[PDB]
């Protein structure tokens, strides 16, 4: 199905409150300090995004730890974490696991 | 089809010589200075890998420039570039374009 269908089914299932902006980007907060953005690009890629605060900028950024990989980047000089995967074949179960996995990773870093 | 089917069809089409090792990793050289490794992990992910020499380690590593993204990492303190995408939905045409695109990117950096 489309990104929104997936997104809806996702939040409507996990009973989590969400926030969609004008550009069609979903946001969900973990506890009270973790914000995760989820957008779809070019009708194929699902992007995850979350800020890290003032984490250890020294990250080798190799693939292997996660599938897909969690990449640490520099935005506004400020540390961020992102993950991407194609929509094709993406089921609600994989979506949930990927998120949990990304959420988990965020905490361990912050 | 499987990774190998794809891989074969790829090299057998572009008329490029290749080299498969013991771990089932394909290698292809561009001109005489560019080596690209292609492996499949967990029967789902196709990984691209190539060394950069002594490039500018200062890379923000944001998504957006390419789909999928070309990530710059540190392996053995030495700069590398990688890209990953799921096998599902992956056709020989996308494979070729992704490679060309990765190859291109390597050159511009080295
Ligand atoms: Pt597009
Ligand atoms: Pt596996």
From Swiss-Prot, chains A, B:
Tell me if Chaperone is a UniProt keyword of this record: yes
| Keywords of the record | Chaperone, Plasmid
Please, one GO biological process term? protein secretion by the type III secretion system
Q: Which residues form the signal peptide?
A: none
What do we know about how this protein assembles, alone or with others? Binds to YopT.
The job of this chain, per UniProt, is described as: Functions as a specific chaperone for YopT.
Q: What is this protein called?
A: Chaperone protein SycT
Q: Which organism is it from?
A: Yersinia enterocolitica
Counting on the full-length protein, the chain here runs from 3 to 112 of 130
């Amino acid at each position: 199905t489309t990104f929104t269908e997936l997104m809806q089914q996702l939040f409507l299932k996990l009973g989590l409150n969400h926030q969609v902006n004008e550009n069609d980007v979903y946001t969900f907060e973990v506890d009270g300090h973790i914000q995760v953005l989820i957008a779809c690009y070019h009708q194929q890629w699902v992007q995850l995004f979350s800020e890290l605060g003032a984490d250890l900028p020294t990250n080798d950024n190799l693939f292997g730890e996660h599938w897909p990989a969690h990449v640490q980047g520099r935005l506004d000089g400020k540390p961020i974490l992102w993950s991407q995967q194609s929509l094709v074949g993406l089921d609600i179960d994989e979506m949930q696991a990927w998120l949990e996995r990304f959420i988990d990773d965020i905490e361990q870093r912050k």
